[PDB]
């Protein structure tokens, strides 16, 4: 059970690191897409 708890803590830390990386990348992607689409709409309106 000590070995199983160690393995469970390892799996939990791995899942938490993966989730943190995924959340950071997803926030970056969402912010980037929003800003880029808004700026593209603004530039298209300016070009029109």
């Amino acid at each position: 059970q000590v070995e199983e708890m160690k393995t469970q803590l390892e799996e939990l830390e791995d899942e938490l690191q993966a989730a943190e990386d995924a959340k950071l990348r997803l926030e970056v992607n969402m912010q980037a897409m929003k800003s880029q689409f808004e700026r593209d709409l603004q530039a298209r309106d300016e070009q029109n």
């Binding site: 912010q31 929003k34 800003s35 808004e38």
Partner: protein, 144 residues
């Protein structure tokens, strides 16, 4: 003229006017008959209508006292529409602002770290990727 005044002032009393528009002259005659105005206060005409002084002011006020409802209703509606539009605009601007904010705050945290001057002195030296990307950028620029 008949039709102008008719469509402009029938709001006061359009109760029993036949929706099928009869002779515009006859139509304004009957509409002012319903309006209960003294004949001498105006001048019925074959093509246009003529009125005394200050009578239009009375008619303007009588018209104005009926439109206020529509006035305030549409005013509130359009104000709320402009409000929600500017709200969406400002919240999108605030999202972009929060992005810029995180970036400049990170810069603040990093503009003073000693390693920065060091590793920024060296970046302008190596530019092979910069050289290539500028080659293609100048290619498309020259083509444009």
């Amino acid at each position: 003229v008949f039709q102008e005044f008719r469509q402009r002032y029938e709001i006061l009393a359009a109760n029993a006017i036949p929706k099928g528009f009869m002779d515009g002259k006859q139509a304004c005659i009957l509409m002012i008959k319903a309006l209960e105005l003294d004949p001498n206060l105006y001048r019925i005409g074959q093509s246009k209508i003529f009125f005394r002084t200050g009578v239009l002011a009375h008619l303007e006020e009588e018209r104005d006292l009926k439109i206020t409802d529509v006035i305030i209703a549409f005013q509130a509606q359009c104000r709320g529409y402009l409000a929600r539009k500017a709200f969406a605009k400002r919240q999108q601007q605030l999202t972009a602002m929060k992005v810029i904010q995180r970036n400049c705050a990170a810069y603040l945290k990093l503009r003073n770290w000693q390693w920065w001057r060091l590793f920024t002195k060296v970046k302008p030296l190596l530019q092979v990727t910069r050289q290539e990307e500028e080659m293609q950028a100048k290619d498309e620029e020259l083509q444009r």
